[PDB]
Structures are given as C-alpha cells and as structure tokens.
Amino acid sequence: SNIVVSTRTGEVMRILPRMHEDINEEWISDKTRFAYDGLKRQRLTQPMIRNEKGLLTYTTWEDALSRVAGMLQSFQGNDVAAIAGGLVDAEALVALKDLLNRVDSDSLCTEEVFPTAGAGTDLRSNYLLNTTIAGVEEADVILLVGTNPRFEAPLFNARIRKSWLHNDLKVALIGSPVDLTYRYDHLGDSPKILQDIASGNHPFSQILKEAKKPMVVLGSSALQRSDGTAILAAVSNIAQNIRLSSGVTGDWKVMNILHRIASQVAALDLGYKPGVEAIRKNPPKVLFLLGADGGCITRQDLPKDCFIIYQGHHGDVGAPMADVILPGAAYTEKSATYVNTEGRAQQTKVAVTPPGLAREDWKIIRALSEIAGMTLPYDTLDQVRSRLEEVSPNLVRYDDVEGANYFQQANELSKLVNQQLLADPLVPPQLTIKDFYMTDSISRASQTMAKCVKAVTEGI
Amino acid sequence: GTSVKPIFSRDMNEAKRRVRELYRAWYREVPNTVHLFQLDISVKQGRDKVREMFMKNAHVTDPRVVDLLVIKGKMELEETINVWKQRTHIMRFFHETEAPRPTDFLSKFYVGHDP
Amino acid sequence: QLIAVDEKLDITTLTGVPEEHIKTRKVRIFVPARNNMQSGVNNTKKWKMEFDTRERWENPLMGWSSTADPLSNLVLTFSTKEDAVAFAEKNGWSFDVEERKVPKPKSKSYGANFSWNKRTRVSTK
Amino acid sequence: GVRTSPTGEKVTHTGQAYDDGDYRRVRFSDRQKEVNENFAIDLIAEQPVSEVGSRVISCDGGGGALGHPRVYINLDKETKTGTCGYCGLQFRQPHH
Amino acid sequence: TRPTIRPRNDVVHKQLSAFGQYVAEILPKYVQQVQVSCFNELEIFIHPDGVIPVLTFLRDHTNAQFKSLADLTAVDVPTRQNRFEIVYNLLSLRFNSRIRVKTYTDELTPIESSVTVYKAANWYEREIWDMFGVFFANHPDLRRILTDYGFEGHPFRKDFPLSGYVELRYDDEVKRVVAEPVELAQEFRKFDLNSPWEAFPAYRQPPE
Amino acid sequence: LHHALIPHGKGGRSSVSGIVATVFGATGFLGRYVVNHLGRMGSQVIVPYRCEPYDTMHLRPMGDLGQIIFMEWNGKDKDSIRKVVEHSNVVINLVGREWETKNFDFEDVFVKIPHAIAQVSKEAGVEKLIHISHLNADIKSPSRYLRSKAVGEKEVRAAFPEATIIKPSDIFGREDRFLNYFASMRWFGGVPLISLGKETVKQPVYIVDVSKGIINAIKDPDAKGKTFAFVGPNRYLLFDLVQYIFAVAYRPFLPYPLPHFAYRWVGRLFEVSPFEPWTTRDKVERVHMSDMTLPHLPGLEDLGIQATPLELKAIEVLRRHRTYRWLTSEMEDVKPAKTVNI
Amino acid sequence: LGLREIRIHLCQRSPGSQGVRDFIEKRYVELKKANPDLPILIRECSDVQPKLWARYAFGQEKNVSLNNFSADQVTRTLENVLSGKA
Numbered sequence A: 001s002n003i004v005v006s007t008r009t010g011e012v013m014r015i016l017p018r019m020h021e022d023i024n025e026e027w028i029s030d031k032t033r034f035a036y037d038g039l040k041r042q043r044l045t046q047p048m049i050r051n052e053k054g055l056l057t058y059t060t061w062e063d064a065l066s067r068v069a070g071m072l073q074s075f076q077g078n079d080v081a082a083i084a085g086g087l088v089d090a091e092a093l094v095a096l097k098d099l100l101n102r103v104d105s106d107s108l109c110t111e112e113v114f115p116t117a118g119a120g121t122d123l124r125s126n127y128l129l130n131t132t133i134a135g136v137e138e139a140d141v142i143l144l145v146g147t148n149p150r151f152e153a154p155l156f157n158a159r160i161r162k163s164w165l166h167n168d169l170k171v172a173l174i175g176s177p178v179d180l181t182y183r184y185d186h187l188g189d190s191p192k193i194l195q196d197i198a199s200g201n202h203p204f205s206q207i208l209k210e211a212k213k214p215m216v217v218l219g220s221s222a223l224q225r226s227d228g229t230a231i232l233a234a235v236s237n238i239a240q241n242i243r244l245s246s247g248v249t250g251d252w253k254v255m256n257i258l259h260r261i262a263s264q265v266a267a268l269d270l271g272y273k274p275g276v277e278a279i280r281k282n283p284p285k286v287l288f289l290l291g292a293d294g295g296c297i298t299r300q301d302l303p304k305d306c307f308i309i310y311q312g313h314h315g316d317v318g319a320p321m322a323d324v325i326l327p328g329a330a331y332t333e334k335s336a337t338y339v340n341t342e343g344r345a346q347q348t349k350v351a352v353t354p355p356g357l358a359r360e361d362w363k364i365i366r367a368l369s370e371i372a373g374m375t376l377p378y379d380t381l382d383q384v385r386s387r388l389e390e391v392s393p394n395l396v397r398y399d400d401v402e403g404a405n406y407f408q409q410a411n412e413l414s415k416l417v418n419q420q421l422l423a424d425p426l427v428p429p430q431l432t433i434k435d436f437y438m439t440d441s442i443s444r445a446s447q448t449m450a451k452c453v454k455a456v457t458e459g460i
Numbered sequence B: 001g002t003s004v005k006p007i008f009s010r011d012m013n014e015a016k017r018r019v020r021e022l023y024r025a026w027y028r029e030v031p032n033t034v035h036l037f038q039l040d041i042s043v044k045q046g047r048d049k050v051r052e053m054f055m056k057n058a059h060v061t062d063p064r065v066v067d068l069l070v071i072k073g074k075m076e077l078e079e080t081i082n083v084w085k086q087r088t089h090i091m092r093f094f095h096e097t098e099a100p101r102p103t104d105f106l107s108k109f110y111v112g113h114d115p
Numbered sequence C: 001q002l003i004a005v006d007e008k009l010d011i012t013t014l015t016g017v018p019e020e021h022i023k024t025r026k027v028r029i030f031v032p033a034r035n036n037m038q039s040g041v042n043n044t045k046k047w048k049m050e051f052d053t054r055e056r057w058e059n060p061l062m063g064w065s066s067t068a069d070p071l072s073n074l075v076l077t078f079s080t081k082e083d084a085v086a087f088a089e090k091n092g093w094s095f096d097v098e099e100r101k102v103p104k105p106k107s108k109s110y111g112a113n114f115s116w117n118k119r120t121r122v123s124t125k
Numbered sequence D: 001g002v003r004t005s006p007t008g009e010k011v012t013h014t015g016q017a018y019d020d021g022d023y024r025r026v027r028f029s030d031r032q033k034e035v036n037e038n039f040a041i042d043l044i045a046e047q048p049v050s051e052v053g054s055r056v057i058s059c060d061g062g063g064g065a066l067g068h069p070r071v072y073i074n075l076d077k078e079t080k081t082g083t084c085g086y087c088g089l090q091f092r093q094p095h096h
Numbered sequence E: 001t002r003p004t005i006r007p008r009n010d011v012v013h014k015q016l017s018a019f020g021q022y023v024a025e026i027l028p029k030y031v032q033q034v035q036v037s038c039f040n041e042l043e044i045f046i047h048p049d050g051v052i053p054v055l056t057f058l059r060d061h062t063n064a065q066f067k068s069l070a071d072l073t074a075v076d077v078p079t080r081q082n083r084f085e086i087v088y089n090l091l092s093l094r095f096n097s098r099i100r101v102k103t104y105t106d107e108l109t110p111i112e113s114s115v116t117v118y119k120a121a122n123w124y125e126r127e128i129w130d131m132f133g134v135f136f137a138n139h140p141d142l143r144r145i146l147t148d149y150g151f152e153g154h155p156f157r158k159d160f161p162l163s164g165y166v167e168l169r170y171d172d173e174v175k176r177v178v179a180e181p182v183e184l185a186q187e188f189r190k191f192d193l194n195s196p197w198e199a200f201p202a203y204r205q206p207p208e
Numbered sequence F: 001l002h003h004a005l006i007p008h009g010k011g012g013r014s015s016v017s018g019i020v021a022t023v024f025g026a027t028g029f030l031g032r033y034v035v036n037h038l039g040r041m042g043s044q045v046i047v048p049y050r051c052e053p054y055d056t057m058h059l060r061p062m063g064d065l066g067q068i069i070f071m072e073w074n075g076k077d078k079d080s081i082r083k084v085v086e087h088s089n090v091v092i093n094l095v096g097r098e099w100e101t102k103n104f105d106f107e108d109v110f111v112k113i114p115h116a117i118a119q120v121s122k123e124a125g126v127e128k129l130i131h132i133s134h135l136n137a138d139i140k141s142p143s144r145y146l147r148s149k150a151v152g153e154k155e156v157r158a159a160f161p162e163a164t165i166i167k168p169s170d171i172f173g174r175e176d177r178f179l180n181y182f183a184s185m186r187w188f189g190g191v192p193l194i195s196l197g198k199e200t201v202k203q204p205v206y207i208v209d210v211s212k213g214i215i216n217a218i219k220d221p222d223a224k225g226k227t228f229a230f231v232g233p234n235r236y237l238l239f240d241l242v243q244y245i246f247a248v249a250y251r252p253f254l255p256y257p258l259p260h261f262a263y264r265w266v267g268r269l270f271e272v273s274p275f276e277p278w279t280t281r282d283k284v285e286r287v288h289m290s291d292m293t294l295p296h297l298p299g300l301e302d303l304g305i306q307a308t309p310l311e312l313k314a315i316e317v318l319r320r321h322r323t324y325r326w327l328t329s330e331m332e333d334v335k336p337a338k339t340v341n342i
Numbered sequence G: 001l002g003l004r005e006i007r008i009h010l011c012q013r014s015p016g017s018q019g020v021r022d023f024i025e026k027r028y029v030e031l032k033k034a035n036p037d038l039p040i041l042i043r044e045c046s047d048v049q050p051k052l053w054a055r056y057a058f059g060q061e062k063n064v065s066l067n068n069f070s071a072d073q074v075t076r077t078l079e080n081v082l083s084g085k086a
C-alpha cells in the first residue's frame, strides 16, 4: 500500500494513506497505520560481538566487520549460507546474493516455502497474482484455497468485498470457515475437494466452467504445510481445466498466488531459492541472518560452533542467538525497492535517518565485501539499481504490473512429480482477529498492537 | 538557429582569448597581492591556486558561460587589486581550517549516513 | 546577432553551489498526494521538486533538531513536468519523476441504495 | 510534589531526569537545576467536584473574557465526572 | 458594499486604458501587451530589445513625461523558460501618473543597461546582478553591491537556500575570520500553510 | 557506547563527536590550540581554570552553545579534580610552568599534580588519559625541569597504566616562548651563546602538529599504553637556528660566546624577579642541550600527520618582530638555514 | 567450468525478441526436463534488447546479445553455453 509518512524534527509522527486506485484505493489496514510506534522500541543501534563470557557487548564497525570477514574468508562454498527475512529490500538481497556468490555459495534461502518442483522460480507467472488487485473487479467467480484474505491481505479482501457488493461476485472458500466480511460458499476444508474439482464430479466445477472470466487464488500460507507441491499441482490442474473447457478467453490469467511477505517476491525474482530446506540438508558453518526472525532455524539444526551473523533493525528471536549483530535501517529510513504480490516494484523514500550507528543494509554488505577482499562493483545506490536491472530487469520499472503468461509451461512441468496430498484440513495461521495484529518484528515491538490484542482478547 | 545572442564572444576562440587575458592578469597580480595582504603563502602557492581555480571549470563548452565566468573573474580581480577584499577573503580560497573529507567508500560508511 | 550555440544548457558553474550538493543530491519531481484528512483537492494542481532527506540529529543543549545540509527546506513549484525536468537538467541535478495520479471517474447513483434485488441496497440511512 | 532520582537530581513535572551515566549532568556542576515545584497535576487534583442539577453544564474557566473559550459538558454518564477540556475542573450530577 | 470594500475609480481606469492604447500604437515594434489592473495601475509588457527605446520615449515624449524612475527590480519564476522578469516603475510629475514596464530574460541573455536614460538605474541594475545574476550589457561599473566580497551565488533566487551554503566564525589558530559549511543548531522548520480549498473562484485556471 | 555519546553530524561546530574532554591547563599556549581543535568537531570541553576568568575569555568562541564549561579548581585539592573529571571520558593534562614559583616547585607541577590527576581519573572511570612530558625527560638530566618530567611520567604510568604519553620537543608557534625568546634577545644587542651554539642540535615542532597529534591520539583505539615522540622534520644547530630566526626578523645578528658559568650567573639574576622571569638557569640549561633522538618511539607520521617544517611557519611568528621597513617582506626570500640531518 | 544459473531477458512485444519468445513457447519445457536442477530464470526487458546471462562459479558471469535471433539460433547458443564449448 502507498502511504505518506508524517515526520517532525527527525521523528516519525504518523502514517496516512496515499491514494493509489490500483492497490489500496485510499485505505490502509490497521497494522499499516498503527505499528509505526514499534520503530521506537527494541532498536539495534550499535554493532555487537560476543565477549569472553559469551555476552553481547557493543563494539565498532571496524571490529565487527573484521571479525565477520575473517570468518567468511576461512569458509567457502556450501558451508556459507544466508536467510532473508520478511522486511528486506531488493538492494540488500542482491548485495548479499553477490557477496555469497563470491565465495561460491548458493545456499541463499527465504523463510517462506514455495514449491521448487517443475517450473518453480524460473517462470514469473508461477508465483504471482497475475489477475492483479484491480482485476478482481472484472471477475464473476473467485475461488480461495487455504487462505484468509481478511488478515493476510486486508486491502485485497476489501477489493473482493467491493466487487462482491457492486459486481455481484460469487465467492467460494476451501479451508476453515473463517469470517470474511461478505457471504461466501464454503465447499469444505479437506484438500481432497481440490482433486474432485479437478476431476469434474463436483457441482462447483460446472460453475467454474460456465462462468466467463473466473479467478482461482491460492494463498501462500497453504504452501508451508509439507505438501504444498501437491496443492499447487491440484490448483494448477483446476486452472488448466478451466482454461481448456472454455478455451483461451484472451488475456485473463486465471491462476493466482497471494503472498503475505513483503520481501518474498523480490527474493524469488532474484532467484533466492525459496524455503529453508537447503540449510537443513547441508548445515552451514557461517549463517547470515538478514532480518530472519521467523525462528525457522535455531542452534539445534546447526553444527556446534556455528558462526551466526544477524543484520536487522529490531531485537527479536533472531538476534540473541547470533555471534555478531550489525544494525540495519528500518523501512522508514532508506530508499529501497519492494515488489508487490502482483510483481509491481515500488521504491521507498527516506523519512528519517537510521538511529545511532545503524547503516543502510546494502551499504553494510558492500563494506563487508570490501573488508573481506572481494569488493563489489557498486558504491552508489544508482549502481546497485543498475545491478538489480542486470539480475532482473523488472525490478527497475517502478509502477509497471504488465507481464507475460507462461501458465502452459508451468502446468506442463507441474505434472511430472505427483507426490500425494495429506488428509489434514486446511487451517490458516490467521484464524481470529487477535492473531492479525502481531505478525512481524515491528509489530511485536509495538505497544499499540499489544493494546489491540489485549482489547480483542478480553474486551470489557 | 536557436535565436541566441552572445554577451561578448561570438565563438569559442574569442572566449579562449579572453580567458587567457584574465589568466595573464591574475598571474601578474598574485605577487602584489601576497605583498600587500601580508600573506604567509609563497607566490608559487598563490599562482598554482589560481591555476587550480581556473581548471576547476575547464569542462565548459558554452561560449556564453565562459564569458560570464570571465566577467566574474574580472570582478574578483578588481576586488583584489583595489584591496576591497581583506586577508580573510583571500585566504577563503585555501580552506585552511577545514578537515579533509574522505572520498573512499569505507571511510564514508564509517563516518555517517551521508554518501 | 546569432551565434547558434549547439550545446546542452548547463549553468552549474555559475550558480555558486558546491559540487557536493550537485553530484550527490537526488531531486524528486512529483504532484503531491492529497492530504487524506481533508477532501479539498486544491493542493494537487502544481508539480513540485524537492530534495532527498539527510541526517537530522539532537543538539546537545535544549535537545533541538539540528541539520547540516542547506537544501532541506527547498521546495520548488512548476506548472508542468517538462518545466521541472528542464530546470533540474540545467541545474545539474539527477531527478526521478512520478506521473500524476488522477482519481478515476466513479459511477454514483442515489437510487442504487434502494435496489430491489441487488446487494447495493443499504440497511440504514 | 517533586521526587528525587537515585543520583539526587530533582525530577521535573514532565518526568525528565538524566541517567546515572549521562554526561550532560556536568552542566549542573557548580550550578543548579531549574525545576518548578508547583506540579499542575496535583494542584488540579485537589480541587473539589462541583455538583450541579443539569444534564449539561457550561464552563469558561472563571473570569468571563479572562478564561478559556466557553464549552459545554454532558453529565449523563453516572459512573464518571464531566471534565473540562481546558480548565480541568470536574462536574457531576447529584446521586445517592 | 459600502463600509469595508475599497471603492473603485472608473475615470482613472479609462484614462490609463486610453494611454496604454496610445503607447501601444506608438511603439508596435516592441510592445507585446498592455494591462490595467483593477486598482488602477498600468502595466506594459515589452520585448527585451525595446528597453532603451520605450523608456526613452516614456521619458521624453511631450504627452508622456516620466522623468522619475521609482524602482527597478527583477522577479524569479523558475517554471518559465525566460526565468527573470525585469520591472521598471516610472513616475510622471507633469501628469501625476505612474506606469510600469516589464520584460524578460534568462540566465545567459544580457539586457541593455538604461544608465543613459536614468542615472538612478546605475545602482539598481547592480543590485539585480548581485541578487539574480542578470547581466547588463553596457553598464559603466557593474559589480556586487549588497553581498559579501567573494560571495558565490545569487541569494534572491528561488533555488538558493534561505541560510546559504557557508557561515562565518573567528578561528583562533589562524587568527582570522573563516568561512565553513553551514551547520544550524536548530533547522528552520518548514510550515505547509496552504489550504486545500479554493479561495478565489475568479482566478481559477482552465484544467486544460 | 552510551547513546548520548554517539557521533552525529558532519563534524562541524554544531555536530556531535561523542567526546567529553577535561583539558587541564587549557589557558596556556598548547591548551588554546587543543581546545580549539576539540571545539571544531563539536566535542564537549570542560576547562578547569585557576586564573582570573577574564584570562579565559579567549576560549569562549571556540565552541558552540553549551559545549565549553568553565569550572574552578585547585591543584592541591583532590575534590576539585574529582569534580572536574567526574563526567569526562577523556582527560588531557597540559599543566606545566617553565619557571619555579614560590608556591609551586617543579615537583609540585610535574609530579604531584599529574599523579593526582591520573589517580582521580582512574578512580572516576575515565577511559583515556593523555599526558604531556618532554622529549629530553631524563632522570639524570642536569635540568630539574626534565628530571621532574621523567619522575612524573613514571608516576602517571604507575597510576594510569593505559595512559597515552606524548613527548614533544620545543614547540614553536605564535604564542611560543621558543621562537619569541630568541627574537627577544635583540634588545640586549648581543646574542650570548654557549660555545657559540655550535654543539647544540634542536628539532622544534609546530604547535598545530602537536594539537592534531593529541586529537588523533584521542580517536586512535590502539594508542592506549603507547608513548609518542613529537618532533619536527629537520634538525638544526643552535647557531644556524638563531641565525635563521634573526634573518627572518630582519635584525642584525651579533652572536658572541659566553662561558657556561657566566650564563648560569646571568640566569640566576633574572630569576629573582617577583613576576615571571625572562630567563632562568633551568631555561639556560634546557636551551643549550641537544635534542635526544628516539627511533624506537612512534611519532607524528604514525598518527597520519606530516610534520610542518619550520621554514613554512616561521614568518607567521617572526613578522611581528620586524620593523616597519621590512614588515611587508615575503616568505621565500630568506634562504633557509642548513640542516644537520643524519 | 561449473555453471550455476542461466538468465534469459526477453521483451514481450518488440520484434527482435520474437525468436526468443518462440523458443520459450516451444523448446523450454523439454530443456527444463533435461536440467532439473539448473535455475533458468526467464525475465522481461525494456524495449532496448534481448539478452542471455550465464553465471559460473565464484560469481563470474558473461552475457550474450540475442537480438533478431531465430529459435534455432537461441537454442544453439544456449546448448553451447551449457556444453563445454565457446
């Protein structure tokens, strides 16, 4: 969502909606509006290392960077790995990718799983919301699979409600009977229904077939349940059956994936190997936690004496388990690139500067590369954006949502491996409004969100 | 075309001629300035400072901009000849009380957020 | 009479700006967004040019907010995007431009509030 | 109603006080710290509650044109006292 | 309408309009536009080449004897291709009237100096050059007048920052006053005072 | 790093360098330069003064609003020393008198006061302590000045183990006693030199170089227990040095040899004055003693500083001693003196 | 020696990318089934030019212009890149 940050005398005072007719349309969600006060708490302001007693103590940039460079020079290849967080910009992502490639490492991962079978990351249409947010006004049938749009993407759910109210949309849900703000048709929560819909026996399948311009939306939250490949294959089969029975209607892009992490699409566009399984199958000796506060990898999944480097802006679960802490900048304190769930890249502007000794993320990575001896070819933000255009050119068009449909190839490659589903009901992580507020690192440090959780839990 | 009118010089050559005249005048004046203002610099220091100030904008290819630069140079020379400038104004060309800002990436990263 | 200069316009050497604030600054050319607290649209008519934000710190006495760059309050107003681009180009600044965001026309109808069979019917007034 | 920090420094009504390791306390060496001892919150707390027989009352701070803009306070809520936005005076409707 | 509204004067409006038409007829080679504002002020917009003729006419013609130059200043409008707008204000004692002459220029185009027409312009033009950077062609002695010695830039320019670029202080090590980059203890606080609602419908511009 | 002590700004007057310095003896010759360099960066300076506050007025414009704080102290009182360094994270010691006075002998000024400062700073938790001694500081030296300097340096090292110690050699500057002292000798009309000054070697150092060395030693992490020798680039014989000094001042040079005993006797006569002595037996001993060479100690070049030669910054000091006739003479028309370099 | 990734940048409306487009339409899937572990990213260019990037070990990477190429040309240079030739 497009916002206006109102600041006074170098302090972020509030967040307001900024009109964008195609994304948020004059509205923002409560988390977008009221979580800004978490930027004043639990901030990482200085570099920190481990002292003789194993405690974290402040140090200078030279000392921490030299220690990290010395650890990085010793290990090369598969022993070096990196994990990206949920609030990471494309510049830092590409800088870390290049730095780890300089030591012949490819163990770059994200905290969210996306199926790597078949086309995987190669085809951009495979992991995007191809219909786009503005396209929901043109559909008449939408099927949501294993997601809760109200909390995972509140503005997307508001768009769905607008289409439902004005265009008489028909909505069906496969998953837990969560309370969307509108009335939908609950087909059930078993994943097996998908196969039935892909078969043709189900009543809903006929509706999809006879309805021109249908939409099928699969939430990313249902791709982390150890069988997301099978669910994705079944949903792609449903989309293919739609595209075949009615033929190609033109440029409609039935298939859709709805993300909930702001750094995921940029990472995938940079080829960042989604999922943390690569770390588990080949444990590393130098771990680069780039804002990774999901708790996916703890010190029990790593070998003894594993050197862990955390680079972020908040003290959270991922911080105190590290050996060196490098203070980065929050999203309000840098001009950075984030890619939408539709693939629309946008850039932030600097509201205030990072507190204390915190620096820009890509600047930290570039300085580390210089100190380690494998200096990177960019010193200016414009040069880093040129590198981004080299790696993936769609990251420098800052309002373009256009793309090409490669659904045929992805569907063809998804048919190769057909690993079975499991008989577990699709349950979204966001079951109740109390789970909506505190979801990421900035929210958990916020006091307003604590008040909101306490109010929605024990109302009175 | 472009319907542009010159200040003094019609082409590049006349502008270069005026530039060389201004350079000769400044080169001549430097020793008298050093004596009158009781500066602690040598004549060679003043002359190479004049050369550096001339070369600071040696990339100009527009005769009008060159003419305006020569006019400003004449203004400064006339200010220095008539002792309208003081010792502080003359020494402001040397930045003697300013710490040298680093130009490499690592020092700038160490110092602050300014690129 | 007419010298017919065939050079791109450039006045960076005449403006007295230090080269630090010419080669390093990044200007932003945009139509400001409407203040969402109000409905008046009179502040979204003209283009504006501004500079990137620099460091502000807390001054040790009185805790006031200090700055070190001179262009922190500089906001210029232009009638058209081409004029702002020309000004930025001739002043040597590197710019980014964002196209104007015009709100699309809507389809309002008072009778739709009382529809016989459509969901747009309101339950209160 | 002033307090004292562990370092022996008076705490102002805004609550500000220098930390133990804060160097800025050196500015008070051989000098004093300016603190106003008449804390406004306690002073307005000791004022009694006015009892009036109306659902809506008006307050202008006292003195007419020498007070604050005249405002109206609704007293229909029973478990709470109407509080003036400007003056801070409290009003209530008779009960019991 | 009576007590608080400024009263209009139609006779002076008619006289000024007639004289503006007279001047425009006499000098068609240079006069581009004529205006009479509603508080009875007459403005003539001319071409830059006509500064010396028009003024001379307005100083010497028997029907128009403007022997006094009240003011001469420039206005900076960055959005225009010709940035600076030169304004001459003339006063006629014989006819007890005032007239205004306007012309335009850019950063590099010089304008003929009018010291031959008016001696008073001698300093005024200097001031313009000091604060706007407009060069006057045949000025007998053109140099900075208001700014400091060796002061770079022209302060009365819309892109010039309010506090400038350098500030002065006495340094004891060198025993003189030195200039250093400006560093304010408290930054000037910018206020956004413009109302989002239109105030005067009469000046509304077409939305193209 | 105590957030309120995190550097901020471009390093200017209003910028914060995160340094809190207590500069003992800031009202002297080196102290003013040190305070000026500290105040340029936006550092907080605490000036302990014992003199008339009027005599500190020249230090007021050196810092921003509230960045220079003046406090009264007593050398023999430990509580004042505790009061003035209780909040500083660096303490610089520049206390020193060139002559002995009736209330403060050389032992008091160079041994007791530095030891007390170091002890109180260690007890107060001060991170860094810069101490200034002499290059010629020897325990066997014939000068009580240098013997006291050596003893006090040993005591400071014993009391503050991580103290940076700096040994300059005959600093010259606008307010120096070294350049002026030789220039001042012209009033007598004959320059008395022991052995014609042909067996004394001097290595004077510029004042700005010493101040920059102190500042860079404050900001250098690996200069805790180190000892630095601050000396100039060139070594001169005393005769040639005085010749160059008189040539720059455009004064007639009439040097004559004076026996050591006679110079000592003359020094004693000057010493009797109630006011500060023009010269003293100690000054005679120090000014006719060759500067020691210590190749095993780091210097200005190890702190990133290129020492300024005397021939570049000598006219700015000696132009005041010229008459009206030569007042406008340039800098590069003196044919600099010969240097006995290795 | 060891290839790590392939990046193909093609514009979706320019004529010079047409052959590349045809390649991805026809002979991409087969390639993906011949290299199941090789990341072959397909991205979109602005109207400038189509290009093919290839990254090797230790961050060394080289680029080839594919302007006005045919589908046979595209597959030929691609199999040259995968093989130990050119």
Ligand SMILES: NC(=O)C1=CN([C@@H]2O[C@H](COP(=O)(O)OP(=O)(O)OC[C@H]3O[C@@H](n4cnc5c(N)ncnc54)[C@H](OP(=O)(O)O)[C@@H]3O)[C@@H](O)[C@H]2O)C=CC1
Pocket: F024, F025, F026, F027, F028, F029, F030, F031, F050, F051, F052, F075, F094, F095, F096, F097, F098, F104, F109, F132, F133, F134, F135, F168, F169, F170, F171, F172, F177, F178
């Ligand atoms: N000057 C030189 O040539 C070089 C000097 N360095 C050393 O560096 C130090 C400072 O140098 P410099 O600036 O030239 O000397 P100054 O005489 O100019 O400075 C003396 C400072 O120390 C203070 N001070 C002196 N005696 C006492 C005392 N008994 N109690 C309290 N304060 C006192 C003075 O205070 P106040 O003025 O108020 O009396 C004054 O602030 C000295 O220790 C000196 O020995 C050593 C090599 C040579």
Ligand SMILES: [Zn+2]
Pocket: D059, D060, D061, D068, D084, D085, D086, D087, D088, D089
């Ligand atoms: Zn009241």
